[PDB]
């Protein structure tokens, strides 16, 4: 089956950068692609990063396409994300989720960013 739950915790002033990440055991993460993300304070939602198929497809919210990382950590149970460009008057919240087809239906706790200042 798979494992998994948002997490991490990071601040993101304008010009910051966070570090989240998606918990993850058996099924690892980018062995069977990962993506996630998708909320925030009445924001509305906010992906972040994530990693479809092998990895070929990735994300990165919706204004950093080269400014966000999806991070990953194998052996550690998660995989992290170095998004920085929000602007101290956006904080948001993410939640995980795969998608690549007998693996997507999962990811479901809530996370965020704190646009440090």
């Known amino acids: 089956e798979v494992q998994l739950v948002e997490s991490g915790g990071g601040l993101v002033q304008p010009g910051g950068s966070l570090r989240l990440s998606c918990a993850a055991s058996?099924?690892?993460?980018?062995?069977?692609?990962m993506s996630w993300v998708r909320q925030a304070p009445g924001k509305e939602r906010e992906i972040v990063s994530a990693?479809?198929?092998?990895?070929?497809?990735?994300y990165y919210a919706d204004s950093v396409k080269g400014r966000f990382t999806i991070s990953r950590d194998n052996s550690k149970n998660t995989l992290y994300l170095q998004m920085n460009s929000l602007r101290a008057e956006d904080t948001a919240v993410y939640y995980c989720?795969?998608?690549?087809?007998?693996?997507?239906?999962?990811w479901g706790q809530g996370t965020l960013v704190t646009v440090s200042s």
């Open positions: 990693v479809s198929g092998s990895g070929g497809s990735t």
């Open positions: 058996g099924f690892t993460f980018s062995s069977y692609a």
């Open positions: 989720a795969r998608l690549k087809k007998y693996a997507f239906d999962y």
